[PDB]
Amino acid sequence: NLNMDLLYMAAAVMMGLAAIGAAIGIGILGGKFLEGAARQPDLIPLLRTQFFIVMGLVDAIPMIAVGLGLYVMFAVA
Amino acid sequence: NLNMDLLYMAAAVMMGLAAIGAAIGIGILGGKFLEGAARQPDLIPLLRTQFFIVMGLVDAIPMIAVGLGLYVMFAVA
Amino acid sequence: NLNMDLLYMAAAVMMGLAAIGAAIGIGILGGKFLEGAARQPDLIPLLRTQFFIVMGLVDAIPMIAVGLGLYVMFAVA
Amino acid sequence: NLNMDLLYMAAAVMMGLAAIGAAIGIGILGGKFLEGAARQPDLIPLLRTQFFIVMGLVDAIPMIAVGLGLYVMFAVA
Amino acid sequence: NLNMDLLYMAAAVMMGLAAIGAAIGIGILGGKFLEGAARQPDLIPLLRTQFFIVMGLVDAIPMIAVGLGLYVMFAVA
Amino acid sequence: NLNMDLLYMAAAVMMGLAAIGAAIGIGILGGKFLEGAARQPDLIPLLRTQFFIVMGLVDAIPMIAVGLGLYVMFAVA
Amino acid sequence: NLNMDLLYMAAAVMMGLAAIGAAIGIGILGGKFLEGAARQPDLIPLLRTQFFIVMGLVDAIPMIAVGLGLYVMFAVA
Amino acid sequence: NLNMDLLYMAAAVMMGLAAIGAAIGIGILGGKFLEGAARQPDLIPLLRTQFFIVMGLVDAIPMIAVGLGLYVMFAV
Amino acid sequence: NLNMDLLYMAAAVMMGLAAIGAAIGIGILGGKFLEGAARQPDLIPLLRTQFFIVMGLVDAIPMIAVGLGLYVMFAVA
Amino acid sequence: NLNMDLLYMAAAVMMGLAAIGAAIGIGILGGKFLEGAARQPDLIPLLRTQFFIVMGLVDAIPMIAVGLGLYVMFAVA
Amino acid sequence: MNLNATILGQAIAFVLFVLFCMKYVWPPLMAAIEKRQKEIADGLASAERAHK
Amino acid sequence: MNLNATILGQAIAFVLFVLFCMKYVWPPLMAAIEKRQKEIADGLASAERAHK
Amino acid sequence: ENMTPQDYIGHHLNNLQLDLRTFSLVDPQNPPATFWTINIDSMFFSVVLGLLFLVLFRSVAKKATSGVPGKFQTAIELVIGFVNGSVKDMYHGKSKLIAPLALTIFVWVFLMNLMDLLPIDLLPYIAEHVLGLPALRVVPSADVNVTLSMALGVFILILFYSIKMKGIGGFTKELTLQPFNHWAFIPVNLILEGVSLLSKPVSLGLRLFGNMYAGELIFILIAGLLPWWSQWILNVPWAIFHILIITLQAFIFMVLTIVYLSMASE
Amino acid sequence: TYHLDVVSAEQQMFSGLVEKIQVTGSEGELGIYPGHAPLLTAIKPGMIRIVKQHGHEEFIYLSGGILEVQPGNVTVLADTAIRGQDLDEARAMEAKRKAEEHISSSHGDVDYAQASAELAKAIAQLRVIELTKK
């Protein structure tokens, strides 16, 4: 039966979009980190610690989406 | 086909657009945290508690979409 | 059967588009609050009040879209 | 079957795109209000009266699109 | 007579795309007004006049799309 | 028959996307005029001249898309 | 037959995407001119010449797309 | 038959999104030229040279999509 | 047959959106490096260090997407 | 015939989306180079060496997609 | 929703409340406030006159 | 679904809503009215003190 | 009682109507088809809320003292001062209409929105069981016809002020000549300024309706879908939010009325 | 080309026509040309490179100041400035000694605000004395 081709398409939509959100959201957040280490280089280990606190939130919803896309393709399909 | 495969496609659209929305909204918000944290390096505990107040609201509406996407795949399909 | 089975796809479109709109708009709005909180930190309890005023204006059209999405899945489908 | 199905689909696209329009457009506008609140806080009651003028025009066009979305579900069925 | 069903779909994409352009255009245009008012608050009735002169051009094409799309939905359908 | 279904939808996508580009382009170009009118009063009529020169070039390709969507709608279908 | 309706649909999406790209691309470029003229009107004759030297390359690709949209709609028909 | 209208549609998606990509990347790029031009006016001939160096990079992929958009359209 | 054919369309959407995610997110981050290097050219060896630290987080998700797009295209095919 | 007519649409999605990613990512990146060269023309050669380093990171993933979009269209046909 | 004559009956109700509010409610209320504002201003003038 | 039960849940949701009016909403208005009778008292009383 | 949750949502979204032919209290099982079927609930609650507005303010205006006000009188002059201060901000002409028009729009549209906060079944239950009327919904501004009735009312004032304060000569110049100036563009300008004219009242009614209709629909859904033990955790956070909506939507209909009538003449 | 005037309350530090200058600024170091951007700014602790006709540089310490480049007569105003051979490379290495000692001898926030300026003065000296060797 044909049905199994749509399950690769559904993981493709789910995992590509979470690659848009996890890449641009760290790009925006990460550039402001660099700007603050260019102007204020006495702060780099603290800003780099705070960057890891806020970066953990940014990719969480993308990490669920990438885990379900791998489950759909390998486990279900 | 048409029952199961569309419910995964509905889940993909719900949990992919929530990945776009919950990631970029926290990148925009989280970059203003780290620049404030570079200008006022004694304020960072005050700004991160403001960041958590504001961050709850931004995530809250995408969380409806992520939880309901999990419901549509597992409970409905 | 395709009639109800597509409505879950209609709700997915409606409440996913609302989630990207509401999360990005509150992320922009919240970024201008945290930078206001870094320039005038003596000021935060005033500015955060103004944030909850206009945040109430940002969510008004998304929250009825999410509500109608839930209605389409649970009351119509 | 699929006449009444597709009417609910057409309201989803209409109300979903209006939910992005209203949310994003007040996010941008309300963030520029908050930065004028941060810069000159004693001036907030003047700028706030300017924000409600401007903000009403922003939503006027998304709110005839949402209103016709509810018309297509509730009146046209 | 299948014809009616697409025409509501054709009206929805006109009024959805009009509400995006006419809401984000007035959001960019008006947020620059509010920083001009934040800088020069005695000018505000001067800048209101320029904002109303420019805001009529932003709404040239979208009030045609809301015009013909609301036509399509009632007159033709 | 099948012809008018698709030919409205083709005009709808044409004048819908034109409604994005002319509204966003005059929003960005007009807000930069209004900071220049706020920043340099005494020059409003000179800047307004430049804004109308530049606005005629922004509206060029979107007005061909309107004129051919009016053609498809009221001439071809 | 069905081929002509989809050729009008092809010319409509091609000219619409050209209309967005060419009009947002000149609204950015021209907003930078109007700020640099606002900075110094003595360079209105000098920038407005660099403006057209640059604005030719903005309109390079969108008039291949408009040139082939017109060809599809009038000569493939 | 159905084969040809789907080719005219697929050329329309390549040659449209190349129109977004080549247009917005040169607005972003050429706006930074103009403010740099308004900033260092005597350097305009020096900065204009680097603008063409980077413009060849920006246009590099949109001209692959326009060369294949004309192939799918006319040569097959 | 579609069980071969759709898998190339399913990989095209994975390696399109992985390419928009990784290219825009590095452009935002990399441009913030380039202004910091122009303002603070003494720090270039420091900021380049931090750029390569943060750059590898931006690529963590877009290389899941492109490695699965290569796997879907060639292994399952 | 029926098989090949959709492999030109798997190619069109990879090279549309990689052409938007590669162009806008280099436009963000290259505009920040022209900023820094307007601050420090003597660093127009130094920043140029950073630009070509960083630009090779930016358009690496878009060229895997522009390669496989040319493989599909001319080797799977 | 239902296109309805309620639009016309409510336009009578709206107009009649604006005519009675315009005549009867608003002139007497504003009289009472502004008369109090004048009393406060005459208090200011009276203090200056005392020290003169 | 029984409808009496939903009216019970609506009662619980109303009681909790009143308490939010009472806990935080009740002060701002009665403060403003009381601060307008302190405002108008001190405006008038200063006019009386100017008569004295 | 076989109320399904979909049927419960159904009957609640059906107003009570009366035919100008039969004079008959229709019910949700079958809707008749004619224009002349007044929505009984909206007229009665609207005038009742508008009467209560006038009875409160007259009971103070007939007695108001320029001494220190009493604690009720002070609540009324706070709203008078708020309305007068917002008119004074955005209107300089001499007209005796704009100030009381702005007052009645603010306090009436506020009182109409206030109905939405009450428990969704309280008044509809009493009307079916105690009285016996087939249907009810109790929020007047959650129905289009009244919101358009006020928005067309403001429209006719926009035309009266634009004709009166600048004459048909001036009004015909602004309609044709702007925004593109040259007489070559006149045929286009009458569409753009005509649709901009027409959009101002269309935005007024549909801004207020869309908020208030979809607000009440959320209270119908939480009561219709969720089991009683669980409703309060979704109903309580929405009512606290909708207190902000009911005030600002009343305030925006006031403000944009003043702005449209004020920028019409000057 | 253009004429540069550099002064402090203690002396006129330079004055004459100059071909290019690279100058400290508020956000970062800045490059100047004939008809350069007509800009006034505050300056960070740093220095200025004075490339004259025939291409001859000289190096002036700018411990603090404000500048103007709008007219063809441009101007730096220095709250303190020192000529590049009245300072020495050994003197700036001693400046490193004081800054590093006060970093060890500062422990609050108010004293760190002075010790940070004492460091910045040393670091800007340590910069110009290396540039001075060209």
PDB file of N, CA and C in Angstrom, chain J residues 5-65:
ATOM      1  N   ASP J   5       7.289  13.958 -14.373  1.00  0.00           N
ATOM      2  CA  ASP J   5       6.727  15.310 -14.274  1.00  0.00           C
ATOM      3  C   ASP J   5       6.766  15.920 -12.866  1.00  0.00           C
ATOM      4  N   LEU J   6       7.124  15.149 -11.836  1.00  0.00           N
ATOM      5  CA  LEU J   6       7.200  15.619 -10.454  1.00  0.00           C
ATOM      6  C   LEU J   6       8.623  15.748  -9.924  1.00  0.00           C
ATOM      7  N   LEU J   7       9.608  15.180 -10.612  1.00  0.00           N
ATOM      8  CA  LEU J   7      11.014  15.380 -10.272  1.00  0.00           C
ATOM      9  C   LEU J   7      11.551  16.755 -10.663  1.00  0.00           C
ATOM     10  N   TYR J   8      10.891  17.466 -11.574  1.00  0.00           N
ATOM     11  CA  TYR J   8      11.168  18.887 -11.776  1.00  0.00           C
ATOM     12  C   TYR J   8      10.547  19.777 -10.704  1.00  0.00           C
ATOM     13  N   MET J   9       9.678  19.231  -9.861  1.00  0.00           N
ATOM     14  CA  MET J   9       9.128  19.946  -8.717  1.00  0.00           C
ATOM     15  C   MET J   9       9.868  19.649  -7.423  1.00  0.00           C
ATOM     16  N   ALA J  10      10.491  18.476  -7.309  1.00  0.00           N
ATOM     17  CA  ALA J  10      11.488  18.249  -6.266  1.00  0.00           C
ATOM     18  C   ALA J  10      12.759  19.066  -6.475  1.00  0.00           C
ATOM     19  N   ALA J  11      13.157  19.308  -7.722  1.00  0.00           N
ATOM     20  CA  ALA J  11      14.267  20.221  -7.983  1.00  0.00           C
ATOM     21  C   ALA J  11      13.911  21.683  -7.717  1.00  0.00           C
ATOM     22  N   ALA J  12      12.704  22.103  -8.088  1.00  0.00           N
ATOM     23  CA  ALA J  12      12.279  23.489  -7.900  1.00  0.00           C
ATOM     24  C   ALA J  12      12.167  23.935  -6.440  1.00  0.00           C
ATOM     25  N   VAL J  13      11.816  23.035  -5.521  1.00  0.00           N
ATOM     26  CA  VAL J  13      11.817  23.376  -4.095  1.00  0.00           C
ATOM     27  C   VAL J  13      13.220  23.476  -3.494  1.00  0.00           C
ATOM     28  N   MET J  14      14.156  22.620  -3.904  1.00  0.00           N
ATOM     29  CA  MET J  14      15.523  22.750  -3.389  1.00  0.00           C
ATOM     30  C   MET J  14      16.235  24.003  -3.875  1.00  0.00           C
ATOM     31  N   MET J  15      16.031  24.382  -5.127  1.00  0.00           N
ATOM     32  CA  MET J  15      16.736  25.539  -5.651  1.00  0.00           C
ATOM     33  C   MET J  15      15.998  26.859  -5.521  1.00  0.00           C
ATOM     34  N   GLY J  16      14.691  26.858  -5.279  1.00  0.00           N
ATOM     35  CA  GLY J  16      14.083  28.065  -4.749  1.00  0.00           C
ATOM     36  C   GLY J  16      14.524  28.382  -3.331  1.00  0.00           C
ATOM     37  N   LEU J  17      14.414  27.405  -2.429  1.00  0.00           N
ATOM     38  CA  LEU J  17      14.709  27.683  -1.026  1.00  0.00           C
ATOM     39  C   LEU J  17      16.193  27.875  -0.726  1.00  0.00           C
ATOM     40  N   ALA J  18      17.089  27.171  -1.418  1.00  0.00           N
ATOM     41  CA  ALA J  18      18.511  27.474  -1.286  1.00  0.00           C
ATOM     42  C   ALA J  18      18.951  28.773  -1.955  1.00  0.00           C
ATOM     43  N   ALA J  19      18.205  29.270  -2.936  1.00  0.00           N
ATOM     44  CA  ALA J  19      18.468  30.582  -3.515  1.00  0.00           C
ATOM     45  C   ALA J  19      18.021  31.763  -2.659  1.00  0.00           C
ATOM     46  N   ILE J  20      16.937  31.609  -1.901  1.00  0.00           N
ATOM     47  CA  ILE J  20      16.594  32.547  -0.833  1.00  0.00           C
ATOM     48  C   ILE J  20      17.540  32.487   0.364  1.00  0.00           C
ATOM     49  N   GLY J  21      17.985  31.299   0.760  1.00  0.00           N
ATOM     50  CA  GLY J  21      18.895  31.226   1.893  1.00  0.00           C
ATOM     51  C   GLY J  21      20.278  31.801   1.625  1.00  0.00           C
ATOM     52  N   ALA J  22      20.882  31.385   0.520  1.00  0.00           N
ATOM     53  CA  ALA J  22      22.208  31.828   0.101  1.00  0.00           C
ATOM     54  C   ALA J  22      22.312  33.325  -0.231  1.00  0.00           C
ATOM     55  N   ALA J  23      21.312  33.889  -0.908  1.00  0.00           N
ATOM     56  CA  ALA J  23      21.260  35.326  -1.200  1.00  0.00           C
ATOM     57  C   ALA J  23      21.060  36.258   0.008  1.00  0.00           C
ATOM     58  N   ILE J  24      20.041  36.032   0.820  1.00  0.00           N
ATOM     59  CA  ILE J  24      19.807  36.839   2.012  1.00  0.00           C
ATOM     60  C   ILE J  24      20.850  36.665   3.121  1.00  0.00           C
ATOM     61  N   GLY J  25      21.347  35.461   3.342  1.00  0.00           N
ATOM     62  CA  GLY J  25      22.473  35.281   4.249  1.00  0.00           C
ATOM     63  C   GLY J  25      23.770  36.001   3.891  1.00  0.00           C
ATOM     64  N   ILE J  26      24.161  35.991   2.626  1.00  0.00           N
ATOM     65  CA  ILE J  26      25.237  36.845   2.111  1.00  0.00           C
ATOM     66  C   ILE J  26      24.921  38.356   2.096  1.00  0.00           C
ATOM     67  N   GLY J  27      23.687  38.756   1.802  1.00  0.00           N
ATOM     68  CA  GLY J  27      23.283  40.150   1.988  1.00  0.00           C
ATOM     69  C   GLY J  27      23.350  40.729   3.396  1.00  0.00           C
ATOM     70  N   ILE J  28      22.903  39.985   4.398  1.00  0.00           N
ATOM     71  CA  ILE J  28      23.162  40.328   5.799  1.00  0.00           C
ATOM     72  C   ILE J  28      24.656  40.424   6.127  1.00  0.00           C
ATOM     73  N   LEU J  29      25.392  39.363   5.825  1.00  0.00           N
ATOM     74  CA  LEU J  29      26.833  39.256   6.018  1.00  0.00           C
ATOM     75  C   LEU J  29      27.641  40.305   5.250  1.00  0.00           C
ATOM     76  N   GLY J  30      27.356  40.497   3.968  1.00  0.00           N
ATOM     77  CA  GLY J  30      28.061  41.491   3.172  1.00  0.00           C
ATOM     78  C   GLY J  30      27.757  42.954   3.463  1.00  0.00           C
ATOM     79  N   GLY J  31      26.534  43.269   3.881  1.00  0.00           N
ATOM     80  CA  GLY J  31      26.224  44.625   4.332  1.00  0.00           C
ATOM     81  C   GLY J  31      26.951  45.063   5.598  1.00  0.00           C
ATOM     82  N   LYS J  32      27.173  44.143   6.539  1.00  0.00           N
ATOM     83  CA  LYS J  32      27.979  44.401   7.740  1.00  0.00           C
ATOM     84  C   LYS J  32      29.468  44.570   7.437  1.00  0.00           C
ATOM     85  N   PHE J  33      29.956  43.978   6.348  1.00  0.00           N
ATOM     86  CA  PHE J  33      31.306  44.262   5.862  1.00  0.00           C
ATOM     87  C   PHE J  33      31.404  45.695   5.326  1.00  0.00           C
ATOM     88  N   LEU J  34      30.420  46.148   4.548  1.00  0.00           N
ATOM     89  CA  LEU J  34      30.423  47.517   4.026  1.00  0.00           C
ATOM     90  C   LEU J  34      30.176  48.583   5.097  1.00  0.00           C
ATOM     91  N   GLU J  35      29.514  48.241   6.196  1.00  0.00           N
ATOM     92  CA  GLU J  35      29.489  49.131   7.358  1.00  0.00           C
ATOM     93  C   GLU J  35      30.892  49.338   7.925  1.00  0.00           C
ATOM     94  N   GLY J  36      31.577  48.251   8.250  1.00  0.00           N
ATOM     95  CA  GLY J  36      32.868  48.323   8.915  1.00  0.00           C
ATOM     96  C   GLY J  36      33.948  48.983   8.078  1.00  0.00           C
ATOM     97  N   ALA J  37      33.856  48.841   6.764  1.00  0.00           N
ATOM     98  CA  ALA J  37      34.709  49.537   5.809  1.00  0.00           C
ATOM     99  C   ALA J  37      34.378  51.024   5.670  1.00  0.00           C
ATOM    100  N   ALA J  38      33.186  51.453   6.076  1.00  0.00           N
ATOM    101  CA  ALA J  38      32.874  52.877   6.151  1.00  0.00           C
ATOM    102  C   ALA J  38      33.305  53.501   7.482  1.00  0.00           C
ATOM    103  N   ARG J  39      33.433  52.693   8.537  1.00  0.00           N
ATOM    104  CA  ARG J  39      34.133  53.117   9.748  1.00  0.00           C
ATOM    105  C   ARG J  39      35.638  53.208   9.530  1.00  0.00           C
ATOM    106  N   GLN J  40      36.244  52.176   8.944  1.00  0.00           N
ATOM    107  CA  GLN J  40      37.702  52.091   8.828  1.00  0.00           C
ATOM    108  C   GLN J  40      38.119  51.552   7.466  1.00  0.00           C
ATOM    109  N   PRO J  41      38.219  52.440   6.472  1.00  0.00           N
ATOM    110  CA  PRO J  41      38.692  52.070   5.130  1.00  0.00           C
ATOM    111  C   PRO J  41      40.032  51.343   5.081  1.00  0.00           C
ATOM    112  N   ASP J  42      40.964  51.675   5.967  1.00  0.00           N
ATOM    113  CA  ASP J  42      42.212  50.932   6.113  1.00  0.00           C
ATOM    114  C   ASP J  42      42.011  49.472   6.514  1.00  0.00           C
ATOM    115  N   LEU J  43      40.880  49.144   7.132  1.00  0.00           N
ATOM    116  CA  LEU J  43      40.440  47.775   7.397  1.00  0.00           C
ATOM    117  C   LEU J  43      39.511  47.186   6.329  1.00  0.00           C
ATOM    118  N   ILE J  44      39.204  47.923   5.261  1.00  0.00           N
ATOM    119  CA  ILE J  44      38.514  47.368   4.088  1.00  0.00           C
ATOM    120  C   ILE J  44      39.274  46.163   3.525  1.00  0.00           C
ATOM    121  N   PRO J  45      40.632  46.095   3.553  1.00  0.00           N
ATOM    122  CA  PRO J  45      41.288  44.831   3.182  1.00  0.00           C
ATOM    123  C   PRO J  45      41.236  43.775   4.285  1.00  0.00           C
ATOM    124  N   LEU J  46      41.282  44.178   5.558  1.00  0.00           N
ATOM    125  CA  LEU J  46      41.295  43.219   6.665  1.00  0.00           C
ATOM    126  C   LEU J  46      39.938  42.536   6.815  1.00  0.00           C
ATOM    127  N   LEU J  47      38.877  43.340   6.852  1.00  0.00           N
ATOM    128  CA  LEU J  47      37.492  42.867   6.906  1.00  0.00           C
ATOM    129  C   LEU J  47      37.112  42.040   5.679  1.00  0.00           C
ATOM    130  N   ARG J  48      37.630  42.414   4.514  1.00  0.00           N
ATOM    131  CA  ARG J  48      37.499  41.579   3.322  1.00  0.00           C
ATOM    132  C   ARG J  48      38.085  40.174   3.502  1.00  0.00           C
ATOM    133  N   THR J  49      39.188  40.018   4.241  1.00  0.00           N
ATOM    134  CA  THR J  49      39.703  38.664   4.465  1.00  0.00           C
ATOM    135  C   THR J  49      38.800  37.850   5.397  1.00  0.00           C
ATOM    136  N   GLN J  50      38.179  38.497   6.382  1.00  0.00           N
ATOM    137  CA  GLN J  50      37.154  37.879   7.229  1.00  0.00           C
ATOM    138  C   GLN J  50      35.876  37.550   6.459  1.00  0.00           C
ATOM    139  N   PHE J  51      35.512  38.375   5.486  1.00  0.00           N
ATOM    140  CA  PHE J  51      34.299  38.143   4.705  1.00  0.00           C
ATOM    141  C   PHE J  51      34.344  36.838   3.903  1.00  0.00           C
ATOM    142  N   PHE J  52      35.408  36.611   3.156  1.00  0.00           N
ATOM    143  CA  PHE J  52      35.560  35.373   2.398  1.00  0.00           C
ATOM    144  C   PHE J  52      35.718  34.092   3.253  1.00  0.00           C
ATOM    145  N   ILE J  53      36.356  34.166   4.420  1.00  0.00           N
ATOM    146  CA  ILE J  53      36.301  33.086   5.426  1.00  0.00           C
ATOM    147  C   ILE J  53      34.873  32.712   5.863  1.00  0.00           C
ATOM    148  N   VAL J  54      34.122  33.696   6.337  1.00  0.00           N
ATOM    149  CA  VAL J  54      32.769  33.561   6.874  1.00  0.00           C
ATOM    150  C   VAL J  54      31.727  33.199   5.810  1.00  0.00           C
ATOM    151  N   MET J  55      31.856  33.775   4.615  1.00  0.00           N
ATOM    152  CA  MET J  55      31.008  33.511   3.453  1.00  0.00           C
ATOM    153  C   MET J  55      31.050  32.063   2.963  1.00  0.00           C
ATOM    154  N   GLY J  56      32.201  31.408   3.031  1.00  0.00           N
ATOM    155  CA  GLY J  56      32.284  29.963   2.825  1.00  0.00           C
ATOM    156  C   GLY J  56      31.534  29.075   3.813  1.00  0.00           C
ATOM    157  N   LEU J  57      31.418  29.498   5.071  1.00  0.00           N
ATOM    158  CA  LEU J  57      30.505  28.867   6.038  1.00  0.00           C
ATOM    159  C   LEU J  57      29.030  29.086   5.687  1.00  0.00           C
ATOM    160  N   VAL J  58      28.674  30.324   5.353  1.00  0.00           N
ATOM    161  CA  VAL J  58      27.313  30.748   5.020  1.00  0.00           C
ATOM    162  C   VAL J  58      26.674  29.925   3.887  1.00  0.00           C
ATOM    163  N   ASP J  59      27.304  29.855   2.710  1.00  0.00           N
ATOM    164  CA  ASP J  59      26.835  29.109   1.541  1.00  0.00           C
ATOM    165  C   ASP J  59      27.419  27.710   1.359  1.00  0.00           C
ATOM    166  N   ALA J  60      27.849  27.044   2.426  1.00  0.00           N
ATOM    167  CA  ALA J  60      28.110  25.609   2.302  1.00  0.00           C
ATOM    168  C   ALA J  60      26.832  24.760   2.221  1.00  0.00           C
ATOM    169  N   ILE J  61      25.876  24.917   3.127  1.00  0.00           N
ATOM    170  CA  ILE J  61      24.665  24.083   3.045  1.00  0.00           C
ATOM    171  C   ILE J  61      23.818  24.384   1.806  1.00  0.00           C
ATOM    172  N   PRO J  62      23.588  25.648   1.433  1.00  0.00           N
ATOM    173  CA  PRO J  62      22.907  25.954   0.168  1.00  0.00           C
ATOM    174  C   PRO J  62      23.508  25.348  -1.099  1.00  0.00           C
ATOM    175  N   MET J  63      24.798  25.027  -1.103  1.00  0.00           N
ATOM    176  CA  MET J  63      25.427  24.363  -2.241  1.00  0.00           C
ATOM    177  C   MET J  63      25.294  22.844  -2.244  1.00  0.00           C
ATOM    178  N   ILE J  64      25.123  22.210  -1.086  1.00  0.00           N
ATOM    179  CA  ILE J  64      24.650  20.828  -1.087  1.00  0.00           C
ATOM    180  C   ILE J  64      23.249  20.728  -1.683  1.00  0.00           C
ATOM    181  N   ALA J  65      22.389  21.707  -1.407  1.00  0.00           N
ATOM    182  CA  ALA J  65      21.051  21.712  -1.999  1.00  0.00           C
ATOM    183  C   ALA J  65      21.029  22.097  -3.482  1.00  0.00           C
TER     184      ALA J  65
END
